[PDB]
Amino acid sequence: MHHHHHHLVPRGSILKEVTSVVEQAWKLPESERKKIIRRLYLKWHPDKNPENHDIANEVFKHLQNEINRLEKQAFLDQNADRASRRTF
């Protein structure tokens, strides 16, 4: 531990909020689990936003990658193969 300097200045605390709600939804089995992603996926939608086309698309970019990122690691772990797939 040294602590010298760090860069952390969001536009309005929009990213840090998504990182919390996303981790909280990763505790439920699946029913209510995915239910949380559907709320933020629609709530933070550009088409739903009144006048936030870019502001919405921005948060969406971080949310989209935040899902598959955990959805893949929180599912594919020790299962004979390694997501190779040979059936098609």
Swiss-Prot record:
Domain J: 14-88
Annotated protein name in UniProt: Sacsin
Compartments where found: Cytoplasm
Gene behind this protein: SACS
Residue span relative to the full protein: 4306 to 4380 of 4579
Top-rank taxon: Eukaryota
Involvement in disease: Spastic ataxia Charlevoix-Saguenay type: A neurodegenerative disease characterized by early-onset cerebellar ataxia, spasticity, retinal hypermyelination, pyramidal signs, and both axonal and demyelinating neuropathy with loss of sensory nerve conduction and reduced motor conduction velocities. Other features include dysarthria, distal muscle wasting, nystagmus, defect in conjugate pursuit ocular movements, retinal striation (from prominent retinal nerves) obscuring the retinal blood vessels in places, and the frequent presence of mitral valve prolapse.
Biological function: Co-chaperone which acts as a regulator of the Hsp70 chaperone machinery and may be involved in the processing of other ataxia-linked proteins.
Domain notes: The ubiquitin-like domain mediates interaction with the proteasome. The J domain is functional and is shown to stimulate E.coli dnaK ATPase activity.
Tissue expression per record: Highly expressed in the central nervous system. Also found in skeletal muscle and at low levels in pancreas.
